[PDB]
């Protein structure tokens, strides 16, 4: 049974774009139907890493449930997670992707954080996250309070260290900033470890799934 994505793109649906709860959360599909010009996708501008690969790996799915990998209300006691952006506005008001959280400073501080998740679900788990690139050094300090920040995602198959590239860009939707989006597959049994002292757009929901 095919999966209609409406006016949304694979990026938008899987990220949890606010203009993308739209649609009939489905549990299985054979192929993915997507308009050539979808209007609400990566609402906050930025590059989605390895996008064609993700569309293929998701082209065929037999089971699919969303679940809250890092619960919004218990995972982040030392960080503000409320931040929203006018670029992701639902019904007029500013908002954000439902599956990610924009972690920002709290009490004037952004402490080193590290949270992990072990796959116990007997299914492949799809994990998405972003890294934020502010357009100038004033924004970097305002959001994370440090000029030299790092993000490091490390699992058994994935090992990357992101440093934010801070500079002026051309404007997409009046934003000069970028969030770069990233994704890895989590084997039943594997564990993924996030470490950062800024710029992490942390995962909130992930997906368990299979392909036949």
């Amino acid at each position: 049974a095919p999966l209609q994505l409406g006016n949304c793109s694979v990026a938008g649906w899987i990220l949890g774009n606010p203009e993308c709860e739209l649609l009939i959360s489905r549990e299985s599909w054979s192929y993915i139907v997507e308009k050539p010009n979808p209007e609400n996708g990566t609402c906050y501008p930025g590059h989605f890493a390895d996008y064609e690969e993700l569309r293929e790996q998701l082209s065929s799915v037999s089971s699919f449930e969303r679940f809250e990998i890092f619960p919004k209300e218990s995972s982040w006691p030392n960080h503000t997670t409320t931040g929203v952006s006018a670029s992701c506005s639902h019904n007029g008001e500013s908002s954000f992707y439902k599956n990610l959280l924009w972690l920002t400073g709290k009490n004037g501080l952004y402490p080193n954080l590290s949270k992990s998740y072990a796959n116990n679900k007997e299914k492949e788990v799809l994990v998405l996250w972003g890294v934020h690139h502010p357009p100038n050094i004033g924004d970097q300090r305002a959001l994370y309070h440090k000029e030299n920040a790092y993000v490091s995602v490390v699992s058994s198959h994935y090992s990357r260290k992101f440093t934010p590239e801070i500079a002026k860009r051309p404007k997409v939707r009046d934003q000069e900033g970028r969030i770069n989006y990233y994704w890895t597959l989590l084997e039943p049994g594997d564990t993924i470890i996030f470490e950062a002292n800024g710029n992490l757009i942390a995962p909130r929901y992930a997906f368990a799934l299979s392909r036949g």
Epitope: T42, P45, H47, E165, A167, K168, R169, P170, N180
Partner: antibody
Framework: QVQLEESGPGLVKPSETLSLTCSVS??????????WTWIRQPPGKGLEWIGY???????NYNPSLKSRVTMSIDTSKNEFSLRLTSVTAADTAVYFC??????????????????WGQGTLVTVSS | DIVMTQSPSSLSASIGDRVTITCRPS??????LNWFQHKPGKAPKLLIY???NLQSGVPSRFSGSGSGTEFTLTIRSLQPEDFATYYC?????????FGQGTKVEIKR
Amino acid sequence: QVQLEESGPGLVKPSETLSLTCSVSGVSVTSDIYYWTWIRQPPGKGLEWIGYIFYNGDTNYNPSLKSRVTMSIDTSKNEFSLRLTSVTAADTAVYFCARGTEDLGYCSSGSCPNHWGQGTLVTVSS
Amino acid sequence: DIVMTQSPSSLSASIGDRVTITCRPSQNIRSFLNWFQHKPGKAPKLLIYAASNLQSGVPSRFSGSGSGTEFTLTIRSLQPEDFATYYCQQSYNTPPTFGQGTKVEIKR
């Protein structure tokens, strides 16, 4: 907020090498998120992209010109340069330097120069 | 290698008029299309990037539209300072290539 000042001969004799410099002010030529570009416009024709160079070393030159152009970065002077060999009257043009900001989601690599200098005219003549 | 055709090559319009310039790539380029403005003796300025995003400092009477194989820059009410030559530029495959330009003059 960034300035790009172009400099160079104005007159080049045919077959000789044209050299131009763009002195960059307001950012560092070593910041790896930007790339540096040259563009030209022959009299009465359209704009023709020459190439981009990133400080980390990745470069790409227009295939129409790739066998005659090289670009370089001089960190000591916060400059970058264009060298064009074996020129003819077809190379008479206003040459623009430009900065771009890498943004692969909205632009291919090195292809959206968004701060241009105002250009310097080079006339090829003997 | 992607060839850009802009139309028309020249136009005149009165103050307050709605002006429209079209751009046609030689193959489909999605949203990877930018618009530049070049006023006399000045540095070229990026007005619209990725088909429809108004760049900072650009007045909101400028808007870009289209995708795929037809693109449009519209000026909803011409002003004297909008005298310039406008160019489209595809950012879809390298090398970046430009249209021949549309020179806009005013009628007063």
